[PDB]
Amino acid sequence: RSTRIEFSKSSLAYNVQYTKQVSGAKTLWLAVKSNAYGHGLLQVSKIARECGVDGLAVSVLDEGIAIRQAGIDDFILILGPIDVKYAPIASKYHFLTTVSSLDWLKSADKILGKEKLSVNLAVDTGMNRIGVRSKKDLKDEIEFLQEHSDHFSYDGIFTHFASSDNPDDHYFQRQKNRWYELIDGLIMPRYVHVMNSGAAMYHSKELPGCNSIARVGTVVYGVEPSEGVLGPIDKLKPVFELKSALTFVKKWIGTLPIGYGDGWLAEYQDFQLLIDGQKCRQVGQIAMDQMMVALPHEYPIGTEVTLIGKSGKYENTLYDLHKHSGVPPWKITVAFSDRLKRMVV
Amino acid sequence: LEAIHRSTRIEFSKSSLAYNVQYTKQVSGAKTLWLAVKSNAYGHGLLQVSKIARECGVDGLAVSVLDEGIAIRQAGIDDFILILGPIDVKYAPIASKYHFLTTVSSLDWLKSADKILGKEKLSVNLAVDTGMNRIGVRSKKDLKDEIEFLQEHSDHFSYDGIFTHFAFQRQKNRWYELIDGLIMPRYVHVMNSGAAMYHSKELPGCNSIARVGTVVYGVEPSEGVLGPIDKLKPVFELKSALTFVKKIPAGEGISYGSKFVTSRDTWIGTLPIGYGDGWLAEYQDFQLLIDGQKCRQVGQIAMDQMMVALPHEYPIGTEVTLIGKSGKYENTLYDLHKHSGVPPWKITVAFSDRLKRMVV
Ligand SMILES: *Cc1c(COP(=O)(O)O)cnc(C)c1O
Numbered sequence A: 001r002s003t004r005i006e007f008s009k010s011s012l013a014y015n016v017q018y019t020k021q022v023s024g025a026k027t028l029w030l031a032v033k034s035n036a037y038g039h040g041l042l043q044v045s046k047i048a049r050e051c052g053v054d055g056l057a058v059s060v061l062d063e064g065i066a067i068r069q070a071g072i073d074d075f076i077l078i079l080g081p082i083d084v085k086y087a088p089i090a091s092k093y094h095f096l097t098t099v100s101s102l103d104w105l106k107s108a109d110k111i112l113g114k115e116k117l118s119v120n121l122a123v124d125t126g127m128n129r130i131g132v133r134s135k136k137d138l139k140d141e142i143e144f145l146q147e148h149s150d151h152f153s154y155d156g157i158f159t160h161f162a163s164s165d166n167p168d169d170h171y172f173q174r175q176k177n178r179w180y181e182l183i184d185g186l187i188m189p190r191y192v193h194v195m196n197s198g199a200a201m202y203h204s205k206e207l208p209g210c211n212s213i214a215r216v217g218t219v220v221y222g223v224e225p226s227e228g229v230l231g232p233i234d235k236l237k238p239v240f241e242l243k244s245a246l247t248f249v250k251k252w253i254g255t256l257p258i259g260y261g262d263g264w265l266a267e268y269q270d271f272q273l274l275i276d277g278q279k280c281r282q283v284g285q286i287a288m289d290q291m292m293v294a295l296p297h298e299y300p301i302g303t304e305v306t307l308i309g310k311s312g313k314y315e316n317t318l319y320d321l322h323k324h325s326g327v328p329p330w331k332i333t334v335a336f337s338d339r340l341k342r343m344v345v
Numbered sequence B: 001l002e003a004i005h006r007s008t009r010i011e012f013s014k015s016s017l018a019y020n021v022q023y024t025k026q027v028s029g030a031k032t033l034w035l036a037v038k039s040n041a042y043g044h045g046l047l048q049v050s051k052i053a054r055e056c057g058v059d060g061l062a063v064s065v066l067d068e069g070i071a072i073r074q075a076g077i078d079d080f081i082l083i084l085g086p087i088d089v090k091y092a093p094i095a096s097k098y099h100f101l102t103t104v105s106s107l108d109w110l111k112s113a114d115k116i117l118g119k120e121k122l123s124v125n126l127a128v129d130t131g132m133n134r135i136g137v138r139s140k141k142d143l144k145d146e147i148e149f150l151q152e153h154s155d156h157f158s159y160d161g162i163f164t165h166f167a168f169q170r171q172k173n174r175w176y177e178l179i180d181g182l183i184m185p186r187y188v189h190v191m192n193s194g195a196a197m198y199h200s201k202e203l204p205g206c207n208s209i210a211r212v213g214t215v216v217y218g219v220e221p222s223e224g225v226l227g228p229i230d231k232l233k234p235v236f237e238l239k240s241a242l243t244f245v246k247k248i249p250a251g252e253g254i255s256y257g258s259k260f261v262t263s264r265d266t267w268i269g270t271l272p273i274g275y276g277d278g279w280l281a282e283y284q285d286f287q288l289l290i291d292g293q294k295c296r297q298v299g300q301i302a303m304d305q306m307m308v309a310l311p312h313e314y315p316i317g318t319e320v321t322l323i324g325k326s327g328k329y330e331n332t333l334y335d336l337h338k339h340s341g342v343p344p345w346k347i348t349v350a351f352s353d354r355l356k357r358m359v360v
């Protein structure tokens, strides 16, 4: 099929360096969860190191396994929790593994055998997702890791911000103050990370001792975290173009093989597509895997259609698609079917 | 990309699929049923559904593109397959080798295929545009010219099918007037879910085949408006399990933007499912089912995780039913449509391949 996502290696490389420049971070870990935010887990993970990425962050065990089976030897962090019965699997594949309880560590100590697990302690400061929420619980975990240094390596500690990209920083300040109170006077490991896209771009200077690592996704994928409210859109480069081609033309209406089942959601109805440097109106409704557009004149089968990207003097951006549909850029890209053809340009 | 080590799963029911196939055949009167398996079988799993299709009474598999048909063949499935969308003419010998009933929408396509097809007899399905269809011929002359080309070039082609796609009256009349007086092949199909359920006896000579998707996947076409919902069986249940449980005080914001704030001491569970799995942002606040009780999914749905308000403490690993039965309750696709604004077929198609699929 002609419907494809064309990922730009040079744009990813540009955004990585720009993120490090603004944040001051010397280490950048790219969030590649959910098929690399829809850009392609394997293709982005393959070119990541060449693009200046120091490590990869996945959400679940299987995304990390897929990266390893593809031959990629990069540093991998699992952001979310994993079932304790899989602790030996996480150790074998050398994953920095997120742990949320002392009970988890106790159960892991019994099954690791001769293996050593790289541990990342989750601290809950307000996201209310996973992690310890008291200084006692955090201290108990650190002590256990030191008591069983044969089975564990205390390598990371982190928290995640619920609103580091929000113009209203009240909750951010509450989380930041809670973070510093919790870690105060405790043994810190080699990786002390808290900076997501919003924190790296708007709050880096407010985070001393924890601003050397950028654990980011959104900004590196060329999307301004607040979408141009708190920072400049122009300084970031879009990392992909979504293209297709006409499969049928009738006397003028052209049909292209993309629909809601592919991620071109019903909410994108009437968002004009680009053909030969011209904006083209939609004809009818977006079907499951096909849709139609009004052509200015006759075009042959195989004529390129640009849905997201540049054509002539015009450009279809993720920002404009958000304003049109109500669907945030990261949600637009994640919704692109993992079945769609993906390539690196 | 399938998260096999994670609890989050789509449990497909073979018995329910078989029931819906039999029911669709009965109501429509169709003796042949072709299941539309486009877009990863409406999200239920292309290979998973295709493997059990014939055992469930399906007579053929309907795909949209060449790659989906090739995927089914490479999985070792020898079932009758038809491609409903157009393919690039250079791929005509590939379609013929795999014995696909191939959709053609132009005389020029046939002329180009006749030049490159050898001993291979391509099974041809003629698309007819009866209104605002995506593909197909729009005139009697163009249809007649295609039929005549196939009949005198029968060394490279086999005139096996003719069709149109419905939503009804203007289209039905136009269909009959276009095919009027012309030679009909063995497969004259027009009935999708809506036509099969509400208009079967209005389609004489073309009501022997049901080319359906929606209804066989257990969804009433009009969602109970024009037909009964209680006569169809849901084909799957979406389940997960708690990965973290905690008791948090009042004044605590949950997830991105702190859209939900606790009012008292509340037990909160974390689930390993998010919009990266196709559990869309607009599904926020849907009441999930845990141990026969309705539990509100609280806070913004993250990419891979979301939280739920629990009535009391539950251990890690406690089963959560998102779509399906639990106690006196049942979360249906209709319930999720009413809550989110997303139709049943659009809900299922949104499920990504990361969400593990199995047959029960
Ligand atoms: C998704 C995620 C990130 C990256 O967030 P962005 O806004 O995309 O930068 C960082 N840390 C954790 C724990 C995450 O889940």
Ligand SMILES: *Cc1c(COP(=O)(O)O)cnc(C)c1O
Pocket: A288, B036, B038, B084, B165, B192, B193, B194, B211, B212, B213, B214, B215
């Ligand atoms: C999707 C499709 C169908 C099945 O439509 P349902 O309402 O889901 O039954 C039938 N024919 C064609 C050409 C299709 O694209």
